[PDB]
Amino acid sequence: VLAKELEDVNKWGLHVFRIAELSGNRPLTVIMHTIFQERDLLKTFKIPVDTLITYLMTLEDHYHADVAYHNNIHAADVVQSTHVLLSTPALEAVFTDLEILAAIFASAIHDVDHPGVSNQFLINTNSELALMYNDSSVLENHHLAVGFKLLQEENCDIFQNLTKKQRQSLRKMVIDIVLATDMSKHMNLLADLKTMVETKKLLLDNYSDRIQVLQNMVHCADLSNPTKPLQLYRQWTDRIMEEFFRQGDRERERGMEISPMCDKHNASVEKSQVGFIDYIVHPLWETWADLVHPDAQDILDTLEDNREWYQSTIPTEKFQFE
Amino acid sequence: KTEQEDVLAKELEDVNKWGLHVFRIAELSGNRPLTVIMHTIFQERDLLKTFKIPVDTLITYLMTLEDHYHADVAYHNNIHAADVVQSTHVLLSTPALEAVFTDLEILAAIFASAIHDVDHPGVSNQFLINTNSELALMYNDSSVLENHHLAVGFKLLQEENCDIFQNLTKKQRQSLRKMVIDIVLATDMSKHMNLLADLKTMVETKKVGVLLLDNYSDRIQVLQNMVHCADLSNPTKPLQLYRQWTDRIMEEFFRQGDRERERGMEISPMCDKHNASVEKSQVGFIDYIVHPLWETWADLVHPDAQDILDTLEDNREWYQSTIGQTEKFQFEL
Amino acid sequence: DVLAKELEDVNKWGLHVFRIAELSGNRPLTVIMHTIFQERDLLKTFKIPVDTLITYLMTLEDHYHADVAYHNNIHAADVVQSTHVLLSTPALEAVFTDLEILAAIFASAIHDVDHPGVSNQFLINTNSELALMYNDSSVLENHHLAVGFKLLQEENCDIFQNLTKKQRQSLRKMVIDIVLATDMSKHMNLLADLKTMVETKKVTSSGVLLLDNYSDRIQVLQNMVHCADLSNPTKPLQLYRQWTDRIMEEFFRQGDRERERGMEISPMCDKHNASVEKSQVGFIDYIVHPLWETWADLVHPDAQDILDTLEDNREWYQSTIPTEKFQFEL
Amino acid sequence: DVLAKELEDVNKWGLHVFRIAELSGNRPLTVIMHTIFQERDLLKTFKIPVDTLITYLMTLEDHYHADVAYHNNIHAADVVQSTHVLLSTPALEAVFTDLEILAAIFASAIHDVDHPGVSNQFLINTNSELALMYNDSSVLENHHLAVGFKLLQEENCDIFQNLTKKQRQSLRKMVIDIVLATDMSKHMNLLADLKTMVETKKVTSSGVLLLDNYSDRIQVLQNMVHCADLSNPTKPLQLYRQWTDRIMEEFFRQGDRERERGMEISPMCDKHNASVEKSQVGFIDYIVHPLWETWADLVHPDAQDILDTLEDNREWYQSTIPTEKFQFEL
Numbered sequence A: 001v002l003a004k005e006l007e008d009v010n011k012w013g014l015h016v017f018r019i020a021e022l023s024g025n026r027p028l029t030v031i032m033h034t035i036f037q038e039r040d041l042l043k044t045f046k047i048p049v050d051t052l053i054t055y056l057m058t059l060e061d062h063y064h065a066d067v068a069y070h071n072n073i074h075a076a077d078v079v080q081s082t083h084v085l086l087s088t089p090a091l092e093a094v095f096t097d098l099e100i101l102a103a104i105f106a107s108a109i110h111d112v113d114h115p116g117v118s119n120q121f122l123i124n125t126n127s128e129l130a131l132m133y134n135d136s137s138v139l140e141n142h143h144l145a146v147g148f149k150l151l152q153e154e155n156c157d158i159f160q161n162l163t164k165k166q167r168q169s170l171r172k173m174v175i176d177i178v179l180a181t182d183m184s185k186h187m188n189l190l191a192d193l194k195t196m197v198e199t200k201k202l203l204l205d206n207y208s209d210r211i212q213v214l215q216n217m218v219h220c221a222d223l224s225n226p227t228k229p230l231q232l233y234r235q236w237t238d239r240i241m242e243e244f245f246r247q248g249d250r251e252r253e254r255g256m257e258i259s260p261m262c263d264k265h266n267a268s269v270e271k272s273q274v275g276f277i278d279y280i281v282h283p284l285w286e287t288w289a290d291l292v293h294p295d296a297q298d299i300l301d302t303l304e305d306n307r308e309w310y311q312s313t314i315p316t317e318k319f320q321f322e
Numbered sequence B: 001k002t003e004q005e006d007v008l009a010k011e012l013e014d015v016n017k018w019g020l021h022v023f024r025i026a027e028l029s030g031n032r033p034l035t036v037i038m039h040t041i042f043q044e045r046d047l048l049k050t051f052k053i054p055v056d057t058l059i060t061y062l063m064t065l066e067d068h069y070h071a072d073v074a075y076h077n078n079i080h081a082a083d084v085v086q087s088t089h090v091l092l093s094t095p096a097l098e099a100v101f102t103d104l105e106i107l108a109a110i111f112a113s114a115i116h117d118v119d120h121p122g123v124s125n126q127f128l129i130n131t132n133s134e135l136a137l138m139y140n141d142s143s144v145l146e147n148h149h150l151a152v153g154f155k156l157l158q159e160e161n162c163d164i165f166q167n168l169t170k171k172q173r174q175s176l177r178k179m180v181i182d183i184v185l186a187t188d189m190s191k192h193m194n195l196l197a198d199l200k201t202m203v204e205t206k207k208v209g210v211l212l213l214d215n216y217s218d219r220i221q222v223l224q225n226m227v228h229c230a231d232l233s234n235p236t237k238p239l240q241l242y243r244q245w246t247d248r249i250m251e252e253f254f255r256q257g258d259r260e261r262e263r264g265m266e267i268s269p270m271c272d273k274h275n276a277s278v279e280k281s282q283v284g285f286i287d288y289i290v291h292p293l294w295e296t297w298a299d300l301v302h303p304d305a306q307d308i309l310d311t312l313e314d315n316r317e318w319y320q321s322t323i324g325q326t327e328k329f330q331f332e333l
Numbered sequence C, D: 001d002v003l004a005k006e007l008e009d010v011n012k013w014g015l016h017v018f019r020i021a022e023l024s025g026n027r028p029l030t031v032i033m034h035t036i037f038q039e040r041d042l043l044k045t046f047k048i049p050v051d052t053l054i055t056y057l058m059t060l061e062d063h064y065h066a067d068v069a070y071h072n073n074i075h076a077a078d079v080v081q082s083t084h085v086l087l088s089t090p091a092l093e094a095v096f097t098d099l100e101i102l103a104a105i106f107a108s109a110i111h112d113v114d115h116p117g118v119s120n121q122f123l124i125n126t127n128s129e130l131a132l133m134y135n136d137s138s139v140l141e142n143h144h145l146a147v148g149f150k151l152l153q154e155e156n157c158d159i160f161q162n163l164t165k166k167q168r169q170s171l172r173k174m175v176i177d178i179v180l181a182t183d184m185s186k187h188m189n190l191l192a193d194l195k196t197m198v199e200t201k202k203v204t205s206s207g208v209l210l211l212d213n214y215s216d217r218i219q220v221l222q223n224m225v226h227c228a229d230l231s232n233p234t235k236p237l238q239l240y241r242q243w244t245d246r247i248m249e250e251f252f253r254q255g256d257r258e259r260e261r262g263m264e265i266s267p268m269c270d271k272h273n274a275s276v277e278k279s280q281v282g283f284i285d286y287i288v289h290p291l292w293e294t295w296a297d298l299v300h301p302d303a304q305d306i307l308d309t310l311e312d313n314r315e316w317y318q319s320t321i322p323t324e325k326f327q328f329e330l
C-alpha cells in the first residue's frame, strides 16, 4: 500500500521512487497533499481541496516525463526534504505559516518545465527562453513564471483566500528562494550563511536574515541526494548522469564543445560524485549542520559514508572548483 | 486521505489522553468510534505484529462487533464501548503499572472492554428476569447480560474473516479467553463490593518503583478493577463529556421506566421521569460507588490518578451545586 | 526581572495580565502603558517626558478603586493592551496616525477611572451627586473622561504639554467620542453603524481599510475600544473564567446594597437567585458575538482566531448551566 | 537511568545492544544477563547468590577481548538476549524445563569467551598450543567452554554451587552439546536434523512442540543458539550494518596477519579485494536464510516478521553491490 509509505513523510529517507510507482506517477501530488494536511495548510490559508489537487496535478504535468532527473520525482524529493528541514528542533517556532508555505511551494515549482539541459546550452543555441531572459538565470526565471502562471488555469488558484499582503509577501519569498537555486549563486549563499553561523543569536529578526535561511534550506534540499540512504542516492546518480550524457550526445551531434560531466565516452561517474561532495555538497551541508547543531549530524554522517562508498569504487574538477 | 479522514486522524492523536472527545470521533468516523479507536490502539500497541492478526480480519471483526451494539440504545451503545476501550488503554499505561502486564494480558483487557456491553437491549437484568425472557431462562437469572455480552463477543469471531485470534496457540487462546471472562463477569454490579474489598486489601500490603504482582489472582484482580474503573469513568471526565453521559443513561433509564409503567410493573430505581432527581442520583452514584472505587485505585497507582480523582470531586461539587428508593439501591452495593 | 519576561507577550492576545499585576506590585496599568508607549515610540513622537508619563500613569491607576472586584486597574490594563493588539491588526496597517493611536490607548486607560463598582441606574435611583451633575445621561462615562482629563493638572502630570493646540483639541475630541461609546446604551446604534460600513466597504490598493472622513475613522476607533472592553469572552478560558468570577462578585455586592436598601435588584445582581453560566451564554449570544461577528467581517479574515475562541468559550459555559429581557432590548 | 528505558526492550527482537553497552560502561553482558536472570527468576529457582552472579558475569565478560571488533562481549550479550527472546516464542511455551533454559542462556553467554579474533584454521596452520591441545578439532569451540567453566573457580564465581550433582551433570552436558554445535562445520547436519524434525513435527494438545527424548530436545536448543548466533541479518538494518562493519574489520585484521606472514588469505579477509555486500548476500542465501526459513517453519508463525526483515535486509545489500566456494561448501 501507498498510504503506509507516506507515514515516512516526516523522515529523512522516504521511499520516494516507491511512492512514485505506487501512486501511478503522482509523487508530487500525493506528497505535497500529505504535507499540506500534515501542516494544516488547507485550514490556515483556506485552500479548497479540489483547487489544491487540481493545481498539484497541473504543476506535476508540467514536469517532463522524458527528463531523467529534473522531473516530478526530483521535485517531490526536494519538497519532502524541505518539509523535514523545516521541522528541525533548532528552528522550532521560528517561521510563520506563510514562510513555511513559501519554502514548500518554492520547492514544488523550483524546476517546473525543465528540458533536461543547462542554461548555457539554451544560451548557445539562441533559444527563445534565453532570448526572453537575456541569458540570466534563464531556467530559474522560467521555473518561477510557469509555476505562477499555472495558478491561472481552471480551479488552480490555491492562494485565492490569501489577503493582498499575504500574496505579495509570499510572491517575493518564492522568487528569492527559487532564484537562489541557480548554481552561480551557490558561492555567495554559502558565504553569507558562513557569516551567520558566526554571529548568531535561534532568532532571525529581519527579512534579510529570514529569507537567507529559507534560501539555503531549499538549496540543501536541492543538493541533498548525497545525504540519503545509499540505495536512493545511487538512483539519483544513475538519473542525473543519464540526463547529463544525453545533453552530451546532443552537444556532440551539433558540433558543440561537450559540457562538464556530459561525455559518456569519458565519464568518471564515481570521481565526479566525490568531487560533488568535496567541493559543493559537503562544504554546504557542514555549514547547515553548524547553524542547527547537532540536528543534522546523522545527515552529515550519511554524507561521509556515501562519499567513502563512492571513493572505494573508483577503479569536470575545474568546473567544480569555479 | 479525504478531508474528514484527516480531521478524524487529528482527533485520534489524543487517544493516549483522558477525556478524548469520543462523541466528535463518533461523528467524524461515520458512527464508527469503536472500529477506529480499537484499530488505533492495536496499531499503537503493535498488537497486530505480536499476535499476527491480519489487518482485514481485525477491521472486519471490529465493524461486526460494533454492528451488534444497538444504535437505538442511548447509553449502552458503541460510543460507550469505545469510551471504556480508550479509558482502559490510558489506565494500562499509567506510570505505576509500567512493564507489569504481558502482551496477552493487555490484549485481554482491551478486547474485554470492547465486547463487554455488546448487544445490550437498554434494560436491566431484573427487567429480563421479571418478564421471563429467553435470555434470563438460558442464563438462570445470573449475570444474564454480562454472560450474553461475552457469548456474543466470542460468537462473532466465527463470522466470515472475523477470527482475530486465528494465529494464537491453544495455550494463548485458553489464557486470553479465561481473562476476558474474568474481566467481563466483573462488570456485573452485584460484584462491586467484593471487587473493591479485594482491591482495598491489595493496596494495604502492596509491594513496589512499579507495582509487584506475581500470582494469577492479583493480576486478574488489577485488570478486572481497571476495566470496572473504565466502566465507571464518566464522573471523572471533563464536565462537557460527563454531562453527555448523564443525559444518555437517564434517557436509557427513563425508557425502561415507561416500559415498566406500560406493563403495570414496579418502576426500577432512577427510571421514573415524572419523579427523578438527576443531580441527586449523581451525587449518590459518586459518593457510594464511583468515589470509593477511584479513591482506592488512586492509592494503588499513587500519584498517577491525582488529576482524575480531583476532576471527580469537582464534578460531584458541581452536581451538588445544582440540586430514597435510589439511595436504598446505591447503598446496598 | 520576572515581570520583564511576561511583558514580552504584550503584543499577544492572552497576556497573563493577572500575574503582571502581581509581579509589578499592583501596578499593571502603569507597566503595560509604559511598555506600549515605548514599543510604539510614543514618547519621542509626542515629546512626552518619561517622568511626567509615569507620574500620570501612577496617578491614573491610583484613581481606580482597589476595592472594586472587576472595574479596577486590572480591567483598565486589560482594555489598554487589547486595544494595542487590535490596533496592530493587518487590515489596519498604516491606517491611523500616531495621534489617533495615542487617542485609542489613552481613552482605554482612562475609560473606567473612578468607577464605584455600581451601575448608572443605582447612581440615578439614589439621587447621587454624580447623576445630578450629568443629568442621568452616561453618568459614569462622562465622569471617567472628566477625572481622566483633570488628573493631567496634578503635579508633573501633563503628558500632552508638548502637543500643539490642533493636536490637543483633536486628541481631546477623539478620546471623548471613544469613551462615551462605552455606555452600553449606545451599543445598539454603534453596531448598526458598523454594519452599514461593512455593506459599503472600501479598501486601499494595499488591501487595508480605506477611511477618508472623520465620521468613519472615529466609528472604527469607537467599535475597536468597544470590542476591547467586551473582550473577556474571547480570551483563553483561564483568563475569561477569572473575569466572570470578578464581574459577578462586583454585581453581587451591588445586589446586596440594593436589598439592604429595599431597592429592586438589578439583572444579574441577585446572589440568591443567580444564573452565572447562562448569563455568560446570554452575554455572548446577544451582545459579544454579534459585535465581534461584525468586527471580523470588517477586518476579514484577521479576527478569525478570536471568533473561534468566543464560540469555544460559549460551549464551555453552555455545558455548565444547571435577565434575558435585559440582554435582548439592547 | 536512561539505561532502564532501554532494558525495557529486553524481551524484544532488536534491542539497542550497542546503546546498552555505552550506558552500562562497556558492561552489556553483565547487565543483560542480570536482567534476564531477574526476569526469569533463575536466582530464586537455583539459589544463585546475587553477588556471585555479578562477580561471575564481570569475570566472564572481562575474558572477552576488548581489542576484538566482533567476537567480544557485545556479541556475547547480543546472542544471550536473542536466545532469551527465542526461548519465549509462543510455539515453545512450557516445553523446556528451568535447567534447560539456564543451559541455553549460560551457553549463549560463554560461547565465544576468550576469542582471539582469528579462525581455527589460522590456529592450526600456525601450530598454536591451543590447536595442539584440541587436536585441530573444534579448537576455539572447545576453548570457549573450558574457559566458561574454568572461571566458575575464581573467587565467589560459582553460580552453580547450590545445584545438586544430578542438575550440575545435566546442565554441563547441555552447555557442552550446545556450544560445540556453534562450530560451522556442524551447520549442515544441524540444519538437516531441524528439517527432519519440521517434516515429522508433533504438537501437544495445547499447540506446542513435542520432544520426548534428549536427542530431540538438545537438537532444538542447539539450533536455537545457532539461530541466535546467526541472527545479525534478521535485525533492524541499523543494527545489522554495525554487525557487518565489525566482523569485516575483524576478518580484515586476520587477512593483514596472514599477508604479513606469507599465508594464504582466508575468504572475506583481503581488505584490498573485498565484496562486503556480495558476501552478506551470499551469507544470507547460503547459510542464514536456509537456517531461519526452517526455524520459522518449526515455530510457525512466530518468526514471520524476523524472516520478513531478513528478506528486506538482503535486498538492501543487493542494492549496494557496485568466498562463494567457501559459503557453498558449508
Ligand SMILES: COc1ccc(C(=O)Cc2c(Cl)cncc2Cl)c(OCC(=O)NCc2ccccc2)c1OC
Pocket: A118, A181, A182, A183, A184, A222, A223, A225, A226, A236, A237, A240, A241, A261, A272, A273, A275, A276, A280, A320
Ligand atoms: C547526485 O548527482 C548530482 C545531482 C545534481 C547535480 C546538480 O548540479 C543539480 C543542479 C542544480 Cl542543484 C542547479 N543547477 C544545475 C544543476 Cl545540473 C549534480 O551536479 C554536480 C555538480 O558539480 N554541480 C554543479 C553545477 C553547476 C552549474 C551547472 C550545473 C551543475 C550531481 O552530480 C553529477
Ligand SMILES: COc1ccc(C(=O)Cc2c(Cl)cncc2Cl)c(OCC(=O)NCc2ccccc2)c1OC
Pocket: B124, B187, B188, B189, B190, B231, B232, B234, B235, B245, B246, B249, B250, B270, B281, B282, B284, B285, B289, B330, B333
Ligand atoms: C453517569 O451516569 C451513570 C452512568 C452509568 C451508570 C451505571 O450504573 C452503568 C451500569 C454498570 Cl457500570 C453496571 N451494571 C449496570 C449499569 Cl446500568 C449509572 O448508574 C448509577 C448507579 O447507581 N448504578 C448502580 C447500578 C447497580 C446495578 C444495576 C444498575 C445500576 C449512572 O448514573 C445514573
Ligand SMILES: COc1ccc(C(=O)Cc2c(Cl)cncc2Cl)c(OCC(=O)NCc2ccccc2)c1OC
Pocket: C182, C183, C184, C185, C229, C230, C232, C233, C243, C244, C247, C248, C268, C279, C280, C282, C283, C287, C327, C330
Ligand atoms: C465576563 O463577564 C462580563 C464582563 C463584562 C460585562 C459588562 O457588561 C461590563 C459593562 C460595560 Cl462593557 C458597559 N457598561 C456596564 C457594564 Cl457592567 C458583563 O455584563 C453582561 C451584560 O449583559 N452586560 C450588558 C449591559 C451592561 C450594563 C448596562 C447595560 C447593558 C459580563 O457578564 C456578566
Ligand SMILES: COc1ccc(C(=O)Cc2c(Cl)cncc2Cl)c(OCC(=O)NCc2ccccc2)c1OC
Pocket: D119, D182, D183, D184, D185, D229, D230, D232, D233, D240, D243, D244, D247, D248, D268, D279, D280, D282, D283, D287, D327, D330
Ligand atoms: C554480519 O556478518 C557476518 C556475521 C557473522 C559471520 C560468521 O560466520 C560468524 C562465525 C560463526 Cl557464527 C561461527 N564460526 C566462525 C565465525 Cl567467523 C559472518 O561470516 C560469513 C560467513 O559466510 N560465515 C561462514 C563461516 C564458516 C566457517 C568459519 C567462519 C565463517 C558474517 O559475514 C561476513
Ligand SMILES: [Mg+2]
Pocket: A110, A111, A181
Ligand atoms: Mg534547478
Ligand SMILES: [Mg+2]
Pocket: B116, B117, B187
Ligand atoms: Mg454492562
Ligand SMILES: [Mg+2]
Pocket: C111, C112, C182, C183
Ligand atoms: Mg464602562
Ligand SMILES: [Mg+2]
Pocket: D111, D112, D182
Ligand atoms: Mg564461535
Ligand SMILES: [Zn+2]
Pocket: A074, A078, A110, A111, A222
Ligand atoms: Zn532541482
Ligand SMILES: [Zn+2]
Pocket: B080, B084, B116, B117, B231
Ligand atoms: Zn459498560
Ligand SMILES: [Zn+2]
Pocket: C075, C079, C111, C112, C229
Ligand atoms: Zn470597561
Ligand SMILES: [Zn+2]
Pocket: D075, D079, D111, D112, D229
Ligand atoms: Zn558467536
